[PDB]
From a paper:
EndoE-GH18L crystallized in the P 6 5 space group with one molecule in the asymmetric unit and diffracted to a maximum resolution of 1.7 Å. The high quality of the electron density maps allowed us to trace residues 61–482. The GH18 domain (residues 61–349) adopts the conserved (β/α)8-barrel topology with an overall size of 45 × 46 × 38 Å. A large groove contains the active site. This groove is located at the center of the (β/α)8-barrel and surrounded by the loops connecting β1–α1 (loop 1; residues 70–90, pink), β2–α2 (loop 2; residues 105–111, brown), β3–α3 (loop 3; residues 143–157, orange), β4–α4 (loop 4; residues 185–190, light green), β5–α5 (loop 5; residues 223–227, blue), β6–α6 (loop 6; residues 244–248, green), β7–α7 (loop 7; residues 274–293, light blue), and β8–α8 (loop 8; residues 314–335, red). The floor of this groove is composed of a set of aromatic residues including Y67, W71, F104, Y245, and Y313. The crystal structure of the EndoE-GH18L construct revealed that the linker region folds into two three α-helical bundle (3HB) domains connected by an additional α-helix. The first 3HB domain comprises helices α9, α10 and α11 (3HB-1; residues 350–395), whereas the second 3HB domain covers helices α13, α14, and α15 (3HB-2; residues 421–482). Both 3HB-1 and 3HB-2 domains are connected by a short α-helix, α12 (residues 409–417). The GH18 and 3HB-1 domains interact with each other through an extensive contact area of ca. 972 Å2, representing 7% of the total accessible surface of the isolated domains.
Author numbering: 61 to 482
The structure:
């Protein structure tokens, strides 16, 4: 029932080069790299005038590749429009008619959502609108609720995005939204409690989703939501508070900057991330038990052991998982503190929790026989061992990949047994 949302900066996708940035650095991720356990992805895009041609490959890829792929994983896509867009509703009289509100709601969805291959909409409200404005926005939001959000009967999200608790533009239409996304960058769970109290006349806690940020390059602002020790960080405190108090979930802004700082190196550089903090916040906000976290990590360690040749790092990771006392420490035991510092750059505990339900014991017995039938190759036909080593290395490599299906496992089982049965 809970939510975990991330804001994905479109101009930091690999398909964009030189959009909305003075940095020449190559982008390092695609939307395929978004971690598991994230059920809503907000595509946040700013395209400066003149860069529309540079940004088009991303939009084509979003519509034709990224959105189908994320839908296959159960993820829904949204994007935001500024509250001011609602106030441009055309009308003939002194105020719009029900039909004029409805006409405009359909126009908004077509332009900003449907044409992009996106599923739903956020309203970004970070001002203090007038009473005249709210008559307009109330009508437009009410008209939109027939098509998206809880009142529509559909699975299309309708979200309200804000960094304050300004009630007038919300209190008449709060029932139209799946949840409120509350930006509280830089602040701990004391602010989470206060903000929810202030919003409680119009919003229940289960539909309140607090959010933190990662440090953005070149930013004049300073919001420090990650730090070690882990339990001193805002990312622990807010994720824990959301879980402890049955809130709607959590969100994170700027997925691509997971682990970055505002130091002189990070402030002007685009670098790969092991996504440690996001993967940890997903687990923490859902209250994953330490036992379950360790079980997933040990599952990963065993399945990569047949292709991975670094026995020292595998051993240190297994020991570090055993000593871990926080969800962060389990993840860090495999991912390291930063990209390339651990045994893996891609381990994903939510993904791996899914794979626990697929039995590997038959495949492990087959691969173990193959390994035994390599250590004593001096006792067999080299023309048969070669056909086994080729098949074994292939299955080992694929078994250590991103993910696999139960049907895929039986295929590797048959392949390995066949090579041994000859
Ligand atoms: Cl639908
Ligand atoms: Cl839909
Ligand atoms: Zn927004
Ligand atoms: Zn639908
Ligand atoms: Zn990064
Ligand atoms: Zn990753």
């Amino acid at each position: 029932e809970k939510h975990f949302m991330v804001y994905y900066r479109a101009w930091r996708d690999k398909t964009m080069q030189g959009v909305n940035t003075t940095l020449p650095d190559e982008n390092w991720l695609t939307m395929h790299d978004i971690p598991y356990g994230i059920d809503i992805v907000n595509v946040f895009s700013y395209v400066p005038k003149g860069q529309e041609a540079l940004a088009q490959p991303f939009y084509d890829t979003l519509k034709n590749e990224y959105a189908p792929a994320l839908h296959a994983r159960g993820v829904r896509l949204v994007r935001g429009i500024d509250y001011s867009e609602l106030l441009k509703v055309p009308y003939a009289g002194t105020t719009p008619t029900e039909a004029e509100f409805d006409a405009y709601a359909k126009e908004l969805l077509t332009k900003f959502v449907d044409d992009l291959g996106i599923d739903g909409l956020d309203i970004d409200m970070e001002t203090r609108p007038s009473e005249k404005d709210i008559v307009l926005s109330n009508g437009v939001i009410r008209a939109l609720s027939k098509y998206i959000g809880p009142k529509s009967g559909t699975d299309r999200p309708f979200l309200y995005d804000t960094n304050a608790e300004y009630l007038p533009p919300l209190q008449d239409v709060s029932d139209c939204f799946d949840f409120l996304a509350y930006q509280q960058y830089g602040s701990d769970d004391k602010r989470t409690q206060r903000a929810l109290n202030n919003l409680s006349p119009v919003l229940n806690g289960e539909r309140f989703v607090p959010g933190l940020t990662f440090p953005e390059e070149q930013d004049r602002n300073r919001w420090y939501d990650t730090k070690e020790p882990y339990m001193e960080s805002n990312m622990y405190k807010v994720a824990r508070y959301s879980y402890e108090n049955n809130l709607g979930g959590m969100f994170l802004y700027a997925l691509d900057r997971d682990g970055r700082t505002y130091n002189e190196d990070d402030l002007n550089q685009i670098k790969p991330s092991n996504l440690l903090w996001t993967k940890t916040a997903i687990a923490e906000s859902k209250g994953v038990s330490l036992a379950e976290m360790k079980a997933a990590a040990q599952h990963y360690l065993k399945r990569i052991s047949y292709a991975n040749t670094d026995l020292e790092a595998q051993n240190k990771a297994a020991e570090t998982v055993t000593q871990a006392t926080t969800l962060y420490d389990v993840n860090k035991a495999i991912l390291g503190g930063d990209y390339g510092q651990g045994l893996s750059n891609t381990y994903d505990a939510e993904l791996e929790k899914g794979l626990l339900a697929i039995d590997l014991t038959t495949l492990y017995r087959a691969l173990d026989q193959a390994v035994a039938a390599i250590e004593k190759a001096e006792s067999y036909t080299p023309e048969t061992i070669q056909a086994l080593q080729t098949t074994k290395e292939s299955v080992a490599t694929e078994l250590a990949g991103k993910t696999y299906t139960a049907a895929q496992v039986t295929t590797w089982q048959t392949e390995v047994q066949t090579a041994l049965d000859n």
